[model samples]
Target: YIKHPLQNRWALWFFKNDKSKTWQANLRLISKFDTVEDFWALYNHIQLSSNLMPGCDYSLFKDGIEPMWEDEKNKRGGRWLITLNKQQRRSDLDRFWLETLLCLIGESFDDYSDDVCGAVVNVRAKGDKIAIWTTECENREAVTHIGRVYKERLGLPPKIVIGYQSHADTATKSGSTTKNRFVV
Candidate 1:
């Protein structure tokens, strides 16, 4: 069988909080691959994201980028976050996570793909989160197009709206409470 190579090499990062360790210390690179078959191998071998402990996260970023807000490609960027309720985490979480990954590796954004930094999945107590981080907040058309394509790929209904916020504002204002700079 012929193997399918992806457009870009990607790095998978795992984050599990450790009381004794710094945030960066607790995060580690899991693997990197640029082929479809290799990506599947990694997927099958790892724990399904739904099974990860609360507070844990899995970030899939382009090879040269680190999955952190402080990373150069991330600093001026923003993310389009899809917040999942507790019930949905047990039902739709894994599927949605898979969708997000495939979208990135498959270059689902078309022209706006380059504007995307990567995506992150957060497993938490109340509600889990899936977000696509883009290279800029004010690249309005590109960011919005990325958000529209992402939401469309996920098949989220009209009633469900995902919000995008800049890291610059989120950092200054503290956290999850930041108002959206754009939405789709």
Candidate 2:
């Protein structure tokens, strides 16, 4: 037997839209694991984001929080968005998500690690997305450092870019318009 622990316990959530059910109802708890051993166990057992159906999402958040606009922990939070063009989904999606998990369990961000809330992966036919959510997008120093570190962790090409968007801005945005507060 083996045992390993994460710096902070995290919860994994799955969201499947069911028009018949309330939006919250469609978002369900998948599992919660506090140790490194448990994370690997669960990760091995689940379908990869690349394999998930369109309109479905996988969110890994700190315990006692839901992946949504209304969650108190997330209300003031925002996400660093890494959008993958449809062509990259086959080769990039899974690796990016796994890297994200490792970041959460490994506490790779030094002192700024505490500001991390969770990560989310949205699987869609048009394209896929992976976002690292932070507790406060207002903390420019912490949030920016996290984004740079996260981008480095993903090993994205210098030509590719990642954008950070505040939840408040995203929630009330009009049309297909959105402005990124930070980009790397």
Q: Kindly report which residue pairs in candidate 1 clash with one another.
A: none
Error of 1 at 19 (Å): 5.2
Q: Which pairs of residues have clashing backbones in candidate 2?
A: none
The lDDT per prediction is 0.89, 0.86
Candidate 1 regions off by >4 Å? 19-21, 48-50
- Pick the lDDT winner: 1
Model 2 quality (TM-score): 0.93
Each model's TM-score? 0.93, 0.93
Kindly list the per-residue Cα lDDT of model 2 for residues 43-132, writing each as its tens digit. 988953336789888999989878886788778989899988888846578899999988877888889888888899988887898998
Residue 175 C-alpha lDDT in model 1: 56
In model 2, state the lDDT of residue 151. 95
lDDT of each residue in 39-73, candidate 1, tens digit only: 99999888544367788889999999998888999
